[PDB]
């Protein structure tokens, strides 16, 4: 298994209700520069991050996609390295709680991201895994099982009302 070296915090509200904590194991010594972004953009500490951002799509039984703090709709978001950077590290397969690069194609990396609650193998070698879930799986399945209208956008706003590095 890959080593946890850091970890990050999403306190997250559904129609600004809490719902509870995320803490997610981020794999350092595998994708540093990948791990990088993450904690930065969950500190904020560029001016621009996760906080305050939506999960915009949420499929029962599969996976919760966010990140996208720019457009709020899957079409945005950028790196801590420009609006796209490469590929780290592919050789991690996903797996029931993985941390994932949402993508448009190879190396196209930007700020969204997805965690799973189920196996994904077809995303073996094409999204870069960089963590998983060491805290609130249940909080993952509270919002995995929140009512969805078009194209799986929850009916309410998952929010990430506050995140950080622990």
Same mark, same amino acid.
């Not at 997805?114 to 799986?137: N, Q, S």
């Given at each position: 298994?890959?080593?946890?070296?850091?970890?990050?915090?999403?306190?997250?509200?559904?129609?600004?209700?809490?719902?509870? %904590?995320?803490?997610?194991?981020?794999? =350092? &010594?595998?994708?540093?520069?990948?791990?990088?972004?993450?904690?930065?953009?969950?500190?904020?500490?560029?001016?621009?991050?996760?906080?305050?951002?939506?999960?915009? %799509?949420?499929? %029962?039984?599969?996976?919760?996609?966010?990140?996208?703090?720019?457009?709020?709709?899957?079409?945005?978001?950028?790196?801590?390295?420009?609006? %796209?950077?490469? +590929?780290?590290?592919?050789?991690?397969?996903?797996?029931?709680?993985?941390?994932?690069? #949402?993508?448009? =194609?190879?190396?196209?990396?930007?700020?969204?991201?997805?965690?799973?609650? #189920?196996?994904?193998?077809?995303?073996?070698g094409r999204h870069v895994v960089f963590g998983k879930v060491v805290?609130?799986?249940?909080?993952?399945?509270?919002?995995?099982?929140?009512?969805?209208?078009? &194209?799986?956008?929850?009916?309410? #706003?998952?929010?990430?009302? +506050?995140?950080?590095?622990?």
């Amino acid at each position: 298994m890959p080593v946890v070296t850091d970890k990050v915090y999403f306190d997250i509200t559904i129609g600004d209700e809490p719902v509870g %904590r995320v803490v997610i194991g981020l794999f =350092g &010594n595998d994708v540093p520069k990948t791990v990088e972004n993450f904690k930065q953009l969950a500190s904020g500490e560029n001016g621009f991050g996760y906080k305050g951002s939506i999960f915009h %799509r949420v499929i %029962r039984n599969f996976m919760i996609q966010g990140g996208d703090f720019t457009n709020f709709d899957g079409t945005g978001g950028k790196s801590i390295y420009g609006t %796209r950077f490469d +590929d780290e590290n592919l050789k991690i397969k996903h797996f029931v709680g993985a941390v994932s690069m #949402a993508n448009a =194609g190879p190396n196209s990396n930007g700020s969204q991201f997805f965690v799973t609650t #189920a196996p994904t193998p077809w995303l073996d070698g094409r999204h870069v895994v960089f963590g998983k879930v060491v805290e609130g799986m249940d909080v993952v399945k509270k919002v995995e099982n929140t009512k969805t209208g078009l &194209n799986d956008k929850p009916k309410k #706003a998952v929010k990430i009302n +506050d995140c950080g590095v622990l």
